[model samples]
Target: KKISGGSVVEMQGDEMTRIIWELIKEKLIFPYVELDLHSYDLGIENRDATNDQVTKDAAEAIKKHNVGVKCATITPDEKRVEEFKLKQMWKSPNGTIRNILGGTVFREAIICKNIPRLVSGWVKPIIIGRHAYGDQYRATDFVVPGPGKVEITYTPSDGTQKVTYLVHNFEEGGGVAMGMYNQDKSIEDFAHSSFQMALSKGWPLYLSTKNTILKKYDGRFKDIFQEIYDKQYKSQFEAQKIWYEHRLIDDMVAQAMKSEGGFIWACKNYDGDVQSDSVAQGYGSLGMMTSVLVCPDGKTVEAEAAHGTVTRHYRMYQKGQETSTNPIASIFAWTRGLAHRAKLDNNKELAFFANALEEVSIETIEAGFMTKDLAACIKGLPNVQRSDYLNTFEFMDKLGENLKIKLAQAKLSLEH
Candidate 1:
């Protein structure tokens, strides 16, 4: 009966997730948290209708309220544009929201006892903070095949020109070259965001890079994070019983394999792409992952299921057959975002509720309840039976029932 955290901002996305979106709210959010839901439908058609303005608006709302819980939506390509019959193919809403908010995306794995991890040893969650802007993902240049000189030139807005050597081309081979750059300001912001997130979660931070090879390019990341840590967060981190360190890319990967997994790994653009997948796989099931975008302010956040729209399940639904889509990740998307709200609002009761909800989810699974992907992992082979896991709607109903029991018991324990 007690209302605890700050207001909630909801951003809806497209297609299959839109359907699951309703189920989540009906079976979970509405029953658990009392929130001021600022809803925006960011479906492909609505986005095109609004000229993509709604995405910007939803992002701003998150900034204002400091918490956002989103549903997975489609980021349309050319074929999708034709299918949706849009005015223009739009960029990803996630990209738009992130660009507007200037936040770092941190994907956290939810550890469950029943799920089987590839690593087989990670008992805790490993939060990966990825610097999502500028790097290999946004490089500039082209292929060259000649015996001529190649150079990368950058003309700065401040009336300065900088040029650097790429490579001397040989006559018989094709060579790919790229000119990439990152602003000092963005790197500073990224460091601050990582440090703040680490401090808040009471976790040690590690910045992984291939500094031994791309000394100049990756070294910039190492230097910037070190500078920021020294100047802004070293003492704060130490006080919280946490520390920050740097590791070579290979070493970091190997360390991650054997470690207990309770720290933040601040990875470069490319490493994040590859490492997050490895971490997700190592955690046993993608269905148990939760992603959060933490801004430099350390208060504002947007949380979502790291998995994409359930394309396969959607296909099954089209045939009117029941599916066994896992909803735990989406559920945690709400809990994690709400927990951030509780932290910012100084609402311990709300924080407790969020924590309790997450605990109940893991407890439910550990107590021999799960969807297909998880049950498959447990059986250790492909012949996992239908009775091993519940169907989609049935699975959620189980979660809802478990949630009520956990909430009541938690509150009763608090009273005594």
Candidate 2:
């Protein structure tokens, strides 16, 4: 069956991407596949109406079903609170979901031939897997009032042992102090997710850490990754003509800078945050980045556009002006999530359909049919004219037509 009996948690989001999200389903996905979506309206109004319980429910649903395709939603700030007339300022839904899922967020750049990149060396896609769970995000910090000692103590409830470690001894003056931690179990899960991501991509994996400086702290990450790779994944990686290695964060950055890009870099929490942005900018636009959360167990996945809701484009859209917003990342969100579904369900035809749609998306741009965002990437915005780009609707229409032609060819090939 081209349409299989399976369902995925559909998390609808906010702003311009939300508008593009529906059109994506209409043009690219629904026409080709029979989709069963456990839909959740995660728009700001709905979230406020449900007091944000809807977001929690959606996350739990994804947990149960093991597959989700989410749209970008607004994380309310003070301005957003006033704009939306929101009940209260809300936390990021992505953060909440990540806390619940406890997996790595991997961002992969979508490569288009005609689209010029700032880093011309990165012709291929580089998968940046972020250890999204720990480090500074969940750390405790304080202002040191005077010269004093700062320490971390671990007290066992079972009365086995209590260990204390000296963090810092303030000798001269007052300064800021911080204490951070990463659990072994979390590190283990992160390793599994990274290894799984590398295996799926058929690419080598590089785990970056400053183990030289923080031996016991960062060393735990390196040791766990190596332990997992050697015990479980080394043979498979070697068989697949891929390998896993550890690189110092500094060396890793330099290597990444000079090399042709084709590997998964498993980054510590902070490094991922900093580098993904740098990488995204180097790729030209966030519009071409695709983000996915892959569970450690490798059974579940959630996909979304790495870029935000495109608020500026949304404003133009509101004023009845044609906006040339890029929908490629959102479109690929569906394809990537569905491709995973195809693998899990063992649906080759569905997999082919997903791959075909992705190809048409890239081919369309390479053929000089693209949104203004990509047009600006190809030619500077100061020099770009309307003729160089298609409006949002027209761009999707072009993609839809190309997809139809590709699907027909695929069907004919299968029949013959």
Best by TM-score: 2
How accurate locally is residue 336 in candidate 1, as Cα lDDT from 0 to 100? Answer: 89
In angstroms, give how far residue 288 of model 2 lies from its true place.
1.0
Off by over 4 Å in 1: 1-6, 136-152, 160-180, 196-204, 230-243, 258-262, 411-416
Name the candidate that leads on lDDT. 2
lDDT of 2: 0.87
Supply every candidate's count of residue pairs whose N, Cα or C atoms clash at under 3 angstroms. Answer: 0, 0
For candidate 2, write residues 339-407 as lDDT tens digits.
888888898888888888899998898889988888888788898998999999999999999998998
Q: What is candidate 1's CA lDDT for residue 279?
A: 91
lDDT of 1 by residue, 117-187 (tens): 78867877888988767666556667776456666666678977666765565667667666777667777
Lowest-lDDT window of 10 residues in candidate 2? Answer: 1-10
Pairs that collide, model 2: none
Scanning candidate 1 in windows of ten residues, the lowest lDDT window is 165-174
